[PDB]
Amino acid sequence: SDPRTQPLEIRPLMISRVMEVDWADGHTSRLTFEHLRVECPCAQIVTGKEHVSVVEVVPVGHYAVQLHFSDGHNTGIFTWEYLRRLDAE
């Protein structure tokens, strides 16, 4: 019941390379495909993903989405809580 992490709609935008998520607190996250890829849950310097895109967004139960990326990587289950957290980190 946390409005911050209840998604209303998800819009992966291929041209601008950002995934928008509207949340129940009225916030919309705009998370770049690049950012999502380099923070994919599935000191090092993680780089080289500026040209990667999200090819598909598949819901996982009610708690997460699986993002499929253009570099073949398709593990990466992102919980709603995690996606919201990426808006600041």
Which one of 35, 68, 73, 85 is in contact with Cl ion (CB under 5 A)? 35
Q: What residues contact residue 72 under an 8 Å CB cut-off, 6+ apart?
A: none
The binding site for Zn(2+) comprises 35, 39, 89
Q: How far apart are CA 35 and CA 32, in angstroms?
A: 5
DSSP state of 26: S
Residues 35-64 that bind Zn ion (CB under 5 A): 39
User: Which residue type occupies 43?
Assistant: A
Q: How far apart are CA 69 and CA 48, in angstroms?
A: 14
Rule CB under 5 A: is residue 52 a binding residue for Cl ion? Answer: no
Rule CB under 5 A: is residue 54 a binding residue for Cl ion? Answer: no
Closest CB to Cl ion: residue number:
35
- Least separation, in Å, of the C-beta of 1 and Zn ion? 26
Residues making contact with Cl ion (CB under 5 A): 31-32, 35
